[PDB]
Amino acid sequence: GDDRELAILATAENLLEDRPLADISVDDLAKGAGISRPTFYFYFPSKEAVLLTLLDRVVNQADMALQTLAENPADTDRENMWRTGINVFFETFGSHKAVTRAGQAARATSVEVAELWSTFMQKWIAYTAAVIDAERDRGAAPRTLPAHELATALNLMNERTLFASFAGEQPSVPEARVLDTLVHIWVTSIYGE
Amino acid sequence: GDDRELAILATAENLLEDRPLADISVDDLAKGAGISRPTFYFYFPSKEAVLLTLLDRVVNQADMALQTLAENPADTDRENMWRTGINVFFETFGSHKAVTRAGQAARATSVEVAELWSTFMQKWIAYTAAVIDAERDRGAAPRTLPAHELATALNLMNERTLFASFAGEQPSVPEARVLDTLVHIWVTSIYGE
Numbered sequence: 229g230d231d232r233e234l235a236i237l238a239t240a241e242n243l244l245e246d247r248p249l250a251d252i253s254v255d256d257l258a259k260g261a262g263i264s265r266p267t268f269y270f271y272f273p274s275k276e277a278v279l280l281t282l283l284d285r286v287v288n289q290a291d292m293a294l295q296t297l298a299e300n301p302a303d304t305d306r307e308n309m310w311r312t313g314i315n316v317f318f319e320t321f322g323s324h325k326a327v328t329r330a331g332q333a334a335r336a337t338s339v340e341v342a343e344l345w346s347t348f349m350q351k352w353i354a355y356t357a358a359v360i361d362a363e364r365d366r367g368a369a370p371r372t373l374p375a376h377e378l379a380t381a382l383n384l385m386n387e388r389t390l391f392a393s394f395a396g397e398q399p400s401v402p403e404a405r406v407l408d409t410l411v412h413i414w415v416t417s418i419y420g421e
Numbered sequence: 422g423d424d425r426e427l428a429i430l431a432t433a434e435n436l437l438e439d440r441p442l443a444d445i446s447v448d449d450l451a452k453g454a455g456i457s458r459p460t461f462y463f464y465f466p467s468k469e470a471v472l473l474t475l476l477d478r479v480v481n482q483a484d485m486a487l488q489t490l491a492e493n494p495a496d497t498d499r500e501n502m503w504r505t506g507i508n509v510f511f512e513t514f515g516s517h518k519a520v521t522r523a524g525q526a527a528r529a530t531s532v533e534v535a536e537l538w539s540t541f542m543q544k545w546i547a548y549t550a551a552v553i554d555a556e557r558d559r560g561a562a563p564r565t566l567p568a569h570e571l572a573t574a575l576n577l578m579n580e581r582t583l584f585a586s587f588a589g590e591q592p593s594v595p596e597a598r599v600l601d602t603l604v605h606i607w608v609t610s611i612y613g614e
């Protein structure tokens with residue numbers, strides 16, 4: 229039951245490594261999960277709903293990892309503090325590139341995917357802004373741009389730049405350089421005048 | 422002839438203000454240009470080809486403006502130098518929001534739109550990197566990240582952030598704040614250690 233759903237989700241994540249959702253049939257998902265087509269429809273209404281659930285799992289995996297980091301005392305080294313946090317996103321989305329690629333594409337065609345992504349980006353921006361505000365309050369960061377506006381641009385940079393790196397787009401930062409690239413821009417923009 | 426093509430392009434840019442390309446018919450474009458459907462097909466093969474030409478015009482308008490700025494002596498004020506350049510993109514794409522929105526959407530579905538955008542982003546990144554290299558050579562900027570990698574991330578930030586602002590996405594930087602936001606991040610990341 230839970231196990232049926234897990235098998236459909238695992239099959240979909242596997243097939244998305246090889247081809248887009250458009251070239252994956254319900255027969256393919258049902259076959260991979262060892263069930264019939266009609267039994268598939270008991271668990272999910274469409275292959276698009278399967279992708280929504282996969283992306284929801286990956287997004288909440290990143291969010292929960294960030295929460296675990298937030299619960300711990302702050303790294304006393306400002307650059308390392310931000311690197312560890314950006315690395316949650318680098319590793320979580322980078323470890324699920326098939327879902328990341330299919331989920332990005334689906335933001336265009338699916339209101340539910342677009343709203344899921346928007347909701348979590350707002351959460352992540354709000355958290356970023358609250359950390360920059362704490363750094364300013366402690367006298368560690370200068371009072372330059374409105375923190376929420378700076379947070380927004382930095383989060384959008386990461387959204388576009390990490391994706392271009394994962395997907396091997398031209399142009400892109402090489403995957404093996406993207407974390408250092410983003411950390412530099414975050415730290416100089418948060419701490420600089 | 423040239424004038425036929427201009428009227429079809431003007432009609433398409435006007436209708437894209439109100440609805441997406443999917444809800445614009447060839448009859449709509451032909452009607453707006455004062456021609457028949459078959460006469461439309463003499464000038465363009467599809468409504469998608471019309472959008473390609475519109476986006477090509479806007480992209481080359483931005484590129485030519487950047488070239489005009491590049492031809493002049495450099496602004497001696499580093500922050501203003503980068504602000505004027507980012508403003509070319511802010512004003513050119515911001516003055517054509519209907520084409521910008523339709524062109525962004527088309528990167529997903531059109532190889533020709535995706536390649537056009539990729540080509541000009543590579544050009545703009547290469548130019549950015551060459552300016553950062555000149556600033557380092559003159560001793561005005563520190564030798565931190567590889568210039569081309571830093572340029573790539575900053576250009577991708579602008580691509581995503583300017584678009585989110587123009588489209589009124591949630592999240593986004595308000596349009597009236599986006600130029601200052603991006604200039605701050607560029608200048609601190611290019612000149613900071």
Ligand SMILES: CCCCCCCCCCCNC(=O)N1CCC(C)CC1
Pocket residue numbers: 283310313314317321328329331332345352353355356383384386387388390391
């Ligand atoms: C579906 C779609 C695909 C795409 C995906 C990937 C992207 C991701 C992004 C993220 C942002 N954010 C960040 O990055 N951060 C914040 C907080 C912290 C503190 C750090 C960082």
Ligand SMILES: CCCCCCCCCCCNC(=O)N1CCC(C)CC1
Pocket residue numbers: 476503506507510514521522524525538545546548549576577579580581583584
């Ligand atoms: C179709 C799609 C839509 C989207 C559009 C808009 C975006 C734009 C972007 C640009 C990048 N770049 C920049 O920004 N820059 C460089 C150089 C100079 C020097 C500055 C700046």
